[PDB]
RNA sequence: UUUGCUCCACACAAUAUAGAUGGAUACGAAUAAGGCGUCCUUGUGGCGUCGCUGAACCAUAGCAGGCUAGCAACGGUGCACUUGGCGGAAAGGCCUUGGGUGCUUGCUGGCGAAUUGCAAUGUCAUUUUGCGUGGGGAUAAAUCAUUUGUAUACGACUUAGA
RNA sequence: GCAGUCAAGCGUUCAUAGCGACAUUGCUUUUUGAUUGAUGUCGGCUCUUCCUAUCAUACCGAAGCAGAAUUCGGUAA
RNA sequence: AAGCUCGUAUCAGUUUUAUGAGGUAAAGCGAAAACUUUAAAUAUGUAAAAUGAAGAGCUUUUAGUGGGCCAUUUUUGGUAAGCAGAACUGGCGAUGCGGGAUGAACCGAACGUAGAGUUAAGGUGCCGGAAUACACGCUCAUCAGACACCACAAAAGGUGUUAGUUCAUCUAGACAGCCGGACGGUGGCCAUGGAAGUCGGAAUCCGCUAAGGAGUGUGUAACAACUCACCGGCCGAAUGAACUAGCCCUGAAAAUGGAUGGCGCUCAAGCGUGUUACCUAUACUCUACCGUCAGGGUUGGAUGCCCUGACGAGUAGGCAGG
RNA sequence: GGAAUACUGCCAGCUGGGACUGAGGACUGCGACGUAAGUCAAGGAUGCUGGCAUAAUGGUUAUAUGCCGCCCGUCUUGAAA
């Protein structure tokens, strides 16, 4: 959907003679809090055998992008499952927010590796501060001084069935 | 330019249901042999 | 990788003029004019001066960028043909039956007529493409020279002449008769 | 117009006013066509009647001129 | 909105145009398609020719005069694509098909009428650049249509006459434009421009 | 996916890599440390027998050859650091193939030796040809009609395709011998030598161009200065 | 065959309509390009301008459109005629000449409308078929029966006969 | 096919917990080139059509293919 | 169906609580995995809090019935592969309706007569009601694909295309190209008419080297020549190898002419995914009406009358009114 | 440092257009507005107006058009043929 980023903090279930559990925190990209909590429980169990009943979510907050209208190069480390084993992937995404980059990554995974939301785990999203630290050329290409490109073959939308002139694809 | 016959992509009900049964049997045997 | 832009250079020597409009290319040099219809390719032509012309592809894939260099090389060949021409020398060899090669005029057109190939009673006719002139080498045995502005025309004429004298149902180890492209060069060979 | 890459909103406003972009836009046939479309959409029934009357008058004058020349 | 709509079929994709025409005819609009020899089909010429040859081999085995009739002309190929999209065995489908005419070239009287296009079916607007495509005239001639040259000669004659007509129309348009430019400063011109005219 | 398939050849010698350059750097450092005079020489098209003759022309002295950039880094290309002072002045003047001669012997003696030394090697492209050559019309002989033709045997039939294709010479095989229909001259005096003309002269194997060892300059471990001597 | 047949005009009938309700409003070609205008040393030319929808353009006021008085201009437009061309793809239509005849909302005036009662398609289009008038025009064949045999199961075919 | 031989790889990661592609003993078997047919309820003819997995005819590719003849292969009903 | 009893009854194809079960090996923490104490519940019993329920128990009686097919799950035994024997639970039978073009076992949903609204499953180029919607990617098939698939051809092959993982080399110069070098014992040793790196069998050595195999191939009768292994100059900038995944081609198939349902579709009208809008079932909501049943009221056609609520599939068979 | 806006939610906030329905038949009830009189949208539609009064609405019938609909009964087996 339209993704949001949630910080989710959970812990073990308190018991007698058991104070101060290990406060496990995670950052989950999900359309809503119900899905975020389910994903948190799933990842917690995968990390360590902590069932949903054996745990408790003590906090969940929505994290907004700090400078939402600044263009940022993001490196995204993920891992996803298939019929073959799990694979680790590094991707570079140029966008103005982490949620936008994560949505782009989910769509790219679906289009390329046929993977889905339940199969992708987002290990880390980080802004790459220096231009020189980028690796993928499909991102490094848009970083040159005085970048300019045309948009050849413009296709205009027609509201009516019939047009009374041949269309031009000029731009 | 003698164009030859082309295989039909119109699936028959008999073949479709037979394939369904084949898949079910394949999964059951996969479970049994994984147990063994 | 789906590059944003790819460019190739086309140099223009001091004697030739290139006119490009809607991907029709006319090259006019000291030796004449050539015209190429490149509307089956999707490229953009630009010039910064009278000595250099850029050919660019925007947001192209592998096949598009593959065609880009081809377009550049074709225009280069047009420039070379209009400034220095092309000269293909062929030699015909035989064991017993001397190959007889003549320029004849049949139905108002030029033909290379080949007689007595391996003793054949059949007359072979190879139409001379327009723009290429046929000559016979002086002080050289069994050499025919094809000269033209269009490398496509000259090379296809030489290929037609070579293929028309194929050896059929024999051993090519034993029977060496035929017409062969001896050499490919230009009409100017100063050094 | 000249704009530094990544310029913030106030900088964009400053460069925009300096380059007089709104005037350049208002001075074109495209923007004038948009304005004409909006005005014609806004015309009243009485005003469409007035347009018909004025078009007949202008037509009369122009046909007379065309016949003369 | 016209009583008759004349579509210049040049540079249109066969199936998308057929879909549009079928819906219009069923909704009650009279349509004339001209220049069916200039329709396009996406895909390679060899591929579309193979598809036609498969169609050609399909025939009733015990009596070929009963089997599918393989029409070679471009207008008839387009008509086949359209009849496949109409329910032609009903009275409503027959009445829809009675509202359509398809032609090769632009014969009289349509050669002096306005021709339109269908943008959602135009090759330049639909196909991605670089994709190979087939032309209906070449396909028809390869499969046995025998009037490609006659139509081409007639269309050349029509174009010569049409160019002369357009030269005269261009002259008259220039004269009228001047006559209107001399009247841009009048009070009526100012009032009309204030009202948007 | 549509990529050129690299040629796969099973041969013993493997490209050495960075460690060989490291060892060359160390060896030149040792030579400059333990010798007095280092001469820079140019040996562009020099055969291994000539290199070995110069190598054995001294035992105490040492000859080092290799990568120009590696040697220029070892000697020192900048003023931030260099083994000795004013070495960048010598390093800048090196031009092509590098040669380093380390010695303690007399400058005049080595200058006289490198002046006197001369060799007649193969001719080279874009160089003056000392003697012209013209294949006669007869059966083509291996040497080229210079040595007694009756003594020598004619050119092998295996080289006829090479001569006909790369050397651009009309050649035909008659009874097994290579022949030509008219005398064919390859070059004239003081004429720019083509790649193919050099190839054909070497194919006849008439080594005639005079090769010499040239020196650009030298350096000393006692006075630490650059002297420009132009010996050819 | 008791003015039969046919083409025009008005005059009323009947007929039934895959569906009028201002106008189907004409370059060609390209689309990694074009249209229009202008200029020159005339072309793959220079300069200017346009697109980014027909949301246009043209038409469009008057009893469903009456009857009259003028002004300005000599334009716009319809009808019955006429001049000269052009169009064969299914031309059956386009353009032009001259005079006559109307209208003119380009501008200013003067009379009428009501009662269809607060809406009712509120009847205005065009296909065909008949009957009556007045304006003209033209005066055949086919089939059976008979006959031939280049034909033939019967039909059909093919010959001949004032 | 049997047992193998190592493994290209794989096996919950795990080299002989275990698998396993592609490649290598012996068979009717003795050497010098000796003598050592099934089918009964199917089958005939005629005769139409279709397939190509092509016997012939057409065109090509290779092979000590000299020529001749042939072999193997490609398109082709 | 008829009687008798009672209805703060009597229960329940459900959960929980306490008491058991494959203790199978992940508890953690013990005397040095061999100890022997614990733990969320997949999956059944007993006995006592949750939720629901107006009918329940007993005694006499009457009809019809007395096959199975398909699938899920677990289990035991098997084959080249299919699979067979059990137990459970569903579907169908007696069953219409929407959808999957079509249909025994697929997806929705069970049915009085109607009206309006909304939906399920499935769809929205045209046939055909409904976006030739919006967005990001992939693919071009010389008979693509639009599916039964966590199935068979399927193990792989491809100089198609995309995105990745790990190795590597690189401006003290990478990849590709041109031009140079490519040396000496040595024509190493054995058989050969001859065999000098290159018809043959054995270690494959030593020196000088930037670097040069007792040689990667062509080539001669033997040589020679070229070549590549390796190093250098040339100009300047990233390049190569092995694997992984996606889509595409091959991954064998005959015989009347035919099928993603057809047309047709190629920045799709194909494939993956996201967001909305829209279409329509006898389903859901609301209303009217018919009937059945039920619960209240009725001393002033009572076999009735009034008020209210819920329901309505059906073979054999049963009961009732016509 | 000061705001604004988005998003999500709430209102016993206000207001416009469209469609289907009008069951019931004296009063009784619960309310709303009013000092009261009384009025009201509060236990289910009334008010005003027009045309026609007959084939006009409607019924029946024959056809046409759109979509749908396989020929009945018996008998077998799960079931179908």
From Swiss-Prot, chain A:
Which UniProt keywords are present, listed alphabetically? Answer: Cytoplasm, Isopeptide bond, Phosphoprotein, Ribonucleoprotein, Ribosomal protein, Ubl conjugation
Q: Name one GO molecular function term.
A: structural constituent of ribosome
Q: Which InterPro entries match?
A: Ribosomal_eL20 (IPR028877), Ribosomal_eL20_dom (IPR023573), Ribosomal_eL20_eukaryotes (IPR021138)
Q: Coiled coil: which residue ranges? A: none
UniProt keyword Phosphoprotein present: yes
Give the position(s) of the covalent cross-link described as Glycyl lysine isopeptide (Lys-Gly) (interchain with G-Cter in ubiquitin).
Answer: 124, 130, 148
Give a Pfam family name: Ribosomal_L18A
Which BP terms does GO give this entry?
A: cytoplasmic translation
GO cellular component terms? Answer: cytosol; cytosolic large ribosomal subunit
- Tell me where in this chain the PTM Phosphoserine is found: 31
Location(s), subcellular = Cytoplasm
> Known PANTHER family for this protein?
60S RIBOSOMAL PROTEIN L18A (PTHR10052)
* Quaternary structure, from the entry: Component of the large ribosomal subunit (LSU). Mature yeast ribosomes consist of a small (40S) and a large (60S) subunit. The 40S small subunit contains 1 molecule of ribosomal RNA (18S rRNA) and 33 different proteins (encoded by 57 genes). The large 60S subunit contains 3 rRNA molecules (25S, 5.8S and 5S rRNA) and 46 different proteins (encoded by 81 genes). eL20 forms multiple interactions with RNA and proteins in the central protuberance, connecting components of core functional centers that are located far apart.
Family (UniProt): Belongs to the eukaryotic ribosomal protein eL20 family.
Additional free-text comment from the UniProt record: Present with 54300 molecules/cell in log phase SD medium.
- Please identify the protein, giving its name as recorded: Large ribosomal subunit protein eL20A
User: Gene encoding this chain?
Assistant: RPL20A
Curated annotation (Swiss-Prot), chain B:
Q: Where is the protein localized?
A: Nucleus
Tell me the segments the record calls region Disordered.
Answer: 1-36
Listed Basic residues bias regions: 1-13, 21-34
* Top-level taxon: Eukaryota
Give the free-text miscellaneous remark of the entry. Answer: Present with 7130 molecules/cell in log phase SD medium.
Quote the function comment for this protein. Answer: GTPase required for 60S ribosomal subunit export to the cytoplasm.
Q: What is known of its domains?
A: In contrast to other GTP-binding proteins, this family is characterized by a circular permutation of the GTPase motifs described by a G4-G1-G3 pattern.
Name the protein family: Belongs to the TRAFAC class YlqF/YawG GTPase family.
Could you identify this protein by its name? Nuclear GTP-binding protein NUG1
**Origin organism of this chain?**
Saccharomyces cerevisiae (strain ATCC 204508 / S288c) (Baker's yeast)
UniProtKB/Swiss-Prot annotation, chain C:
- SUPFAM superfamilies of this UniProt entry? Ribosomal protein L6
Q: Does the keyword Ribosomal protein apply?
A: yes
Query: Which organism is the protein's source?
Result: Saccharomyces cerevisiae (strain ATCC 204508 / S288c) (Baker's yeast)
Swiss-Prot/TrEMBL keywords? Cytoplasm, Ribonucleoprotein, Ribosomal protein
Additional record remark: Present with 52400 molecules/cell in log phase SD medium. There are 2 genes for uL6 in yeast.
Keyword Cytoplasm: yes or no? Answer: yes
Q: Name one GO cellular component term.
A: cytosolic large ribosomal subunit
One GO MF term on file is: rRNA binding
InterPro entries referenced in this protein's UniProt entry, alphabetically: Ribosomal_uL6-like, Ribosomal_uL6-like_a/b-dom_sf, Ribosomal_uL6_a/b-dom, Ribosomal_uL6_CS2
| One matching Pfam family | Ribosomal_L6
Superkingdom assignment: Eukaryota
Oligomer and partners: Component of the large ribosomal subunit (LSU). Mature yeast ribosomes consist of a small (40S) and a large (60S) subunit. The 40S small subunit contains 1 molecule of ribosomal RNA (18S rRNA) and 33 different proteins (encoded by 57 genes). The large 60S subunit contains 3 rRNA molecules (25S, 5.8S and 5S rRNA) and 46 different proteins (encoded by 81 genes). uL6 lines the binding pocket for eukaryotic elongation factor 2 (eEF2).
Q: Which PANTHER family did the record assign?
A: 60S RIBOSOMAL PROTEIN L9, 60S/50S RIBOSOMAL PROTEIN L6/L9
Give the protein's recorded name.
Answer: Large ribosomal subunit protein uL6A
- GO annotation (BP), single: cytoplasmic translation
Similarity section: Belongs to the universal ribosomal protein uL6 family.
Locations listed in the record:
Cytoplasm
From Swiss-Prot, chain F:
Q: Keywords on this record?
A: Cytoplasm, Nucleus, Ribosome biogenesis
Query: Where does the UniProt annotation locate this protein?
Result: Nucleus, Nucleolus; Cytoplasm
Q: What is its main location?
A: nucleus
Q: What outcome follows a substitution of residue 66 to D?
A: Bypasses the requirement for phosphatase YVH1 for the release of MRT4
Q: Which GO terms describe its biological process?
A: maturation of SSU-rRNA; nuclear-transcribed mRNA catabolic process; ribosomal large subunit assembly; ribosomal large subunit biogenesis; ribosomal large subunit export from nucleus; rRNA processing
**Origin superkingdom:** Eukaryota
Provide the function of this protein: Component of the ribosome assembly machinery. Nuclear paralog of the ribosomal protein P0, it binds pre-60S subunits at an early stage of assembly in the nucleolus, and is replaced by P0 in cytoplasmic pre-60S subunits and mature 80S ribosomes.
Subunit structure and binding partners: Associates with the pre-60S ribosomal particle.
PANTHER family (UniProt xref): MRNA TURNOVER PROTEIN 4 HOMOLOG, MRNA TURNOVER PROTEIN 4 MRTO4
Q: Please state what the protein is called.
A: Ribosome assembly factor MRT4
Source organism per UniProt:
Saccharomyces cerevisiae (strain ATCC 204508 / S288c) (Baker's yeast)
Q: Could you tell me the gene encoding this protein?
A: MRT4
